[PDB]
Design a protein around this ligand. Sequence first.
Ligand SMILES: OC[C@H]1O[C@H](O[C@H]2[C@H](O)[C@@H](O)[C@@H](O)O[C@@H]2CO)[C@H](O)[C@@H](O)[C@@H]1O
Length: 451
Amino acid sequence: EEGKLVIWINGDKGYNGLAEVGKKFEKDTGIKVTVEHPDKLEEKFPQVAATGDGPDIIFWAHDRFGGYAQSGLLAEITPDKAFQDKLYPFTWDAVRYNGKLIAYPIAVEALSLIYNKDLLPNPPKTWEEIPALDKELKAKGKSALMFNLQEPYFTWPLIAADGGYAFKYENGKYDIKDVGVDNAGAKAGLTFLVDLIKNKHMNADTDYSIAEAAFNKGETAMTINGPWAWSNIDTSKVNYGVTVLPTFKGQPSKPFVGVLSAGINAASPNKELAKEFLENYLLTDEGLEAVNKDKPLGAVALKSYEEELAKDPRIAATMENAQKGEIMPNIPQMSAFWYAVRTAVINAASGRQTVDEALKDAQTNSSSVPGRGSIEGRPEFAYNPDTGEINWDSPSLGGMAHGPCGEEFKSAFSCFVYSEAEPKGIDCVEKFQHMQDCFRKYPEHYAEQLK
Ligand SMILES: OC[C@H]1O[C@H](O[C@H]2[C@H](O)[C@@H](O)[C@@H](O)O[C@@H]2CO)[C@H](O)[C@@H](O)[C@@H]1O
């Protein structure tokens, strides 16, 4: 805290460059800027924020900011009208939640099909043609590709190609009631991916690392990653090339576009110095170059910097892909969506489940769940975090724990209160549904249905 700045940024981004622009700020304001790069920063921020700590400003793809805002963890930004002109308007929209601009857009990210130019003169024009390309390829001790399968971000570009989609853009907003992770398309993709993990084409444990080392070492002719990774493929030169993502079942592979944004903590002692830095030092050709030269940002939201940088081919490819797909939504429900698909891909791809069984759940874990009212909020005062005990008689439960559905309530309430999932209670859905099904057998008993 205090009168000096501290900021969080993901470990794969150029935080050394960010700290570099911080030494400049310091040198011109006498305010030491400290950059950090925690693990599960996206999940760790909303946790550390409530308990006094947390950075003065946090960096992350915009899709995660709707939630922070909802919880009142972020302070609305106040960029000049003139300063809003220096940034593309679409990057500003991806950062406006409920009419309030809640974060500064930095750069738009989009996964691309990276291919070893020395191995593959002509990259796979098709996704389903990878099996016949990894064929004549394995015939040398090399696979066709290796990307992080532990993160739904990298696998989703496929799953959505033939119709898979998160939250439909119904009316003027994202309809949390309309989810498409369990339709024919989503299954056509997930089927193929686990159809490539079965044909031995690629193990189902591959990491971001295990997948980066496998390309940085001429191990595999391809991989799927973003702008921030280009820096290591150049360091340990592998004569790579960045192009459009392979098409699946016809239509293009559509990646979920992300806009790296800087958010100002609501409880940031330095909320004006945050502005000075982000607005006058980072979001400038010099400032963005300092970060970029460390770990590519690829396609920045600064009109000036971008225009004369769309010249680069890899950047043009990144953008072409960003066009094939859709920009991620910022709503609070994204956190859960990502949970559902992360889990669904981890099971349907490890044999733990089948595509049908896995996505069926993904759809239920992404969709809205009932009960929330009679459990989350005031009712939680029954739970004593110290002992971890529940007072089923505390008037805060409204008596819910004692009646026709007393057992069902108890099961759902305790699960949410003992939950350590992300977001909390996302593992208690079925129990919240089971409880809801019980409210319906005694409708005269409940008004927890009045809606
Ligand atoms: O996993 C590395 C990847 O993380 C981010 O994508 C996240 C997204 O921001 C989260 O809100 C959630 O959806 O999980 C995604 C990964 O599955 C970054 O935006 C991306 O740049 C980074 O490479």
